[PDB]
Amino acid sequence: SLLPVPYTEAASLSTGSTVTIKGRPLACFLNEPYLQVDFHTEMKEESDIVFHFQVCFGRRVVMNSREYGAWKQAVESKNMPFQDGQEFELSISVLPDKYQVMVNGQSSYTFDHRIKPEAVKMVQVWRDISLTKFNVSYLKR
């Protein structure tokens, strides 16, 4: 809807940063829409991915990194706090040792840093969602 999807924003991340995303899946869960959030090391979409977060709504979540062109060890989760047909609020916080992903205010996934978050230059949000809000916080030293 309001924001264009695929959505790309230049970004910088460090401990204490938060990425906030508000959106809605474009299809009922029976049709298995996806959502993907990628933290890139360059503005180019083929660049490395420090944190890859892919939701198959109603089924599974996969997290990984792409380093020097190659996907590393996938982390797969069956935790599914997203609700069929509902708007969601997704929050990704940079902690000292990991990303923490909150879904509608509830801690739902974490992912230990494989690359320093300082390597991030770009965030992309895409696949089968509409987006009404995207924010990266920049309040900390």
Site string for a copy of itself, 68-107 (x = CB under 8 A): -x--------------------------------------
Site string for a copy of itself, 32-71 (x = CB under 8 A): --x---x------xx----------------------x--
Give the separation between CA 94 and CA 15, rounded to whole angstroms. Answer: 5
Which residue do the tokens 């997290």 mark? Answer: 63
Instruction: Say if residues 109 and 95 touch (Cβ distance below 8 Å).
Output: no
Which residue do the tokens 């062109």 mark? Answer: 69
Q: Return the residues of window 3-22 that contact a copy of itself according to CB under 8 A.
A: 6
Instruction: Say if residues 37 and 124 touch (Cβ distance below 8 Å).
Output: yes
Candidates 15-23, 24-32, 57-65, 106-114; binding stretch for a copy of itself (CB under 8 A): 24-32
Cα dihedral 55, 65, 15, 133 sign: negative
Candidates 3, 27, 115, 119; binder of a copy of itself (CB under 8 A) is 27
Which residue do the tokens 């083929």 mark? Answer: 46
Question: Considering the rule CB under 8 A, would residue 24 count as an interface residue with a copy of itself?
Answer: no
Site string for a copy of itself, 108-127 (x = CB under 8 A): ------------------xx
Question: Considering the rule CB under 8 A, would residue 28 count as an interface residue with a copy of itself?
Answer: yes
Instruction: Say if residues 23 and 134 touch (Cβ distance below 8 Å).
Output: no
Give the separation between CA 90 and CA 40, rounded to whole angstroms. Answer: 18
Contact residues toward a copy of itself (CB under 8 A) are 6, 26-28, 30-31, 34, 38, 45-46, 69, 126-128
